[PDB]
Swiss-Prot record, chains A, B:
The chain holds residues 1565 to 1872 of 4405 of the full protein. Responsible for the cleavages located at the N-terminus of the replicase polyprotein. Participates together with nsp4 in the assembly of virally-induced cytoplasmic double-membrane vesicles necessary for viral replication. Antagonizes innate immune induction of type I interferon by blocking the phosphorylation, dimerization and subsequent nuclear translocation of host IRF3. Also prevents host NF-kappa-B signaling. In addition, PL-PRO possesses a deubiquitinating/deISGylating activity and processes both 'Lys-48'- and 'Lys-63'-linked polyubiquitin chains from cellular substrates. Changing residue 144 to D: In strain: Alpha/B.1.1.7. Changing residue 68 to A: Partial loss of ISG15 cleavage in vitro. Changing residue 65 to A: Partial loss of ISG15 cleavage in vitro. It is found in: Host endoplasmic reticulum membrane. This is Papain-like protease nsp3. It comes from the Viruses. Changing residue 3 to I: In strain: Kappa/B.1.617.1.
Amino acid sequence: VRTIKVFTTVDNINLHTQVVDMSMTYGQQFGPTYLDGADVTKIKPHNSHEGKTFYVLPNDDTLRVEAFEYYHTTDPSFLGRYMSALNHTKKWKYPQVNGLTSIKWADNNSYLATALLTLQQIELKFNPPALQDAYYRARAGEAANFCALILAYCNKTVGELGDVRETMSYLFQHANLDSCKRVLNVVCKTCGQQQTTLKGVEAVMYMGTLSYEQFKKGVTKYLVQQESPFVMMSAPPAQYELKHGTFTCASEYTGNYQCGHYKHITSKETLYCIDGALLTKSSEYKGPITDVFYKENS
Amino acid sequence: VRTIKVFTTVDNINLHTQVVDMSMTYGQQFGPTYLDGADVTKIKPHNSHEGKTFYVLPNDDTLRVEAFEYYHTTDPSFLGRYMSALNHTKKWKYPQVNGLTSIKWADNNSYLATALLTLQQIELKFNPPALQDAYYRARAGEAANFCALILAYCNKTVGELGDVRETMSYLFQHANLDSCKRVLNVVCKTCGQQQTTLKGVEAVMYMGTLSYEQFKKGVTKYLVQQESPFVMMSAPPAQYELKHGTFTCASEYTGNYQCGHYKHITSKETLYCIDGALLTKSSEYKGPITDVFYKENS
Ligand SMILES: COc1ccc2cc(C(=O)[C@@H]3CCCN([C@H]4CC[C@@H](O)CC4)C3)ccc2c1
Ligand SMILES: COc1ccc2cc(C(=O)[C@@H]3CCCN([C@H]4CC[C@@H](O)CC4)C3)ccc2c1
């Protein structure tokens, strides 16, 4: 009986040594098996597979615990959807653009490139170790796992159209925003003291206007106390002037012929428009903006 | 050496038999130890303690795993805060009022009674087993643990003033609302098709008005497609007429002397105003309403 040693894993942190019978498929021995995202369930071992790490589905208590502790989800379909995405995202290109990891355009991924760029400019602490680890790898230039995890957590497949605001919201809901707070106080003559507090993810998002100065003025009448590391403001795409120095970064969305495309604008010493692998610098920017992000440097 | 057998646990699901030396405190043998919420760290075992279950802090891998799988949090202070709350909430009274578990007023708990009543009228699937288990016990009449867990998860202590909308929002963020959706479509002449989708917890909450008829008929102008088992609408407390049959339940908030009080109104065959252990039935209701809940029967 000819054999090789491989490692199995659900988290790529805890590796489990296995002896594989080379006359049987990976599926016959482990169940559904993946090598760097590729489904090798129906493949018989190759000699080249010696010592390599394979993902398997958590089919026992030990692996179930390891997966829950790493991904913070009990969804049994998660690993398969993550591997399916990773088989694609590992083939994308991740150029450094203006100091930031971006994504060369492929598979309708402009929304993911724009989200990835934004995530590198705001301070976020992810709760699942899987996102924290892959996020730091992405900041360092290797973003394939992060992008595939974003897709899996958001229940989106490679090639499916996506929305930056939605993606950021769902990621914020997997982050520690416990200290973030927005207090609304009613301005009235006879109603007394009326106050409500948004804590956590609700405090870092607002829909209806792009302008933080407009939001800060209130919208019946409210005084706003905003306390968070950042805020995401969103509105329907409309022509909007981004003035250098008045924001951190922003999402542009064009919808010509109902085929939409995102670009990312960031405010450094001047305005930079990052469009996947492309970079364009300008002093002023007017375009159909739909998200603006603001940062409190503290 | 005289001893007794007790069970230790972090989840009250997995019980671990221990032999206790009656000459040492529970703290010397287990660390921080609790009996039905009571801190017995400094108490020596009693003969009456034989065969009883004590909570301990998760101080080894086995207990850490059991606690994370049951509570879905890594906060080391959680168990201690849960036990402190439970030592109080176990002493509260939980009368059945019109088929619903309420709470007799104590320790400024009107917001918790109002939340508990609301939670029994909307269908919610909690992610942490600790909340799902305690919710079904609460529905059956034994709500002390559910109330203590709510306090622990919301980082509130017994006696601290609280907000129903906030409490419901934080609980919604621990529930499976993945299928919930609110689609907003812009009403315009020249802007084309503009649509954004709120998925999950954002879809089940709205702030600014109490009326669902107003919210749906415009919200510049938007067409709303609402798809969720329930929706919570909130606004500053204001005099508001609750019409029988047009809502499921509602939160009234009076602000007397800046120490406020909640009541719960539910629409059954007539209007029921549940004020802890107190009940008043009426055909009409006008009061300072701040939350209204609507349900999608299917
Ligand atoms: C009341 O406040 C807001 C806020 C944002 C709004 C956005 C829009 C949009 O039209 C966004 C623009 C970005 C791209 N998405 C698409 C990406 C592809 C696919 O995922 C469908 C959605 C559409 C409309 C109204 C908004 C209202
Ligand atoms: C823009 O949309 C909304 C929505 C809700 C609002 C509520 C209020 C209130 O005044 C709520 C009323 C309920 C009780 N809380 C208190 C409970 C005790 C303690 O937790 C402090 C808060 C205050 C004000 C404005 C609102 C605006």
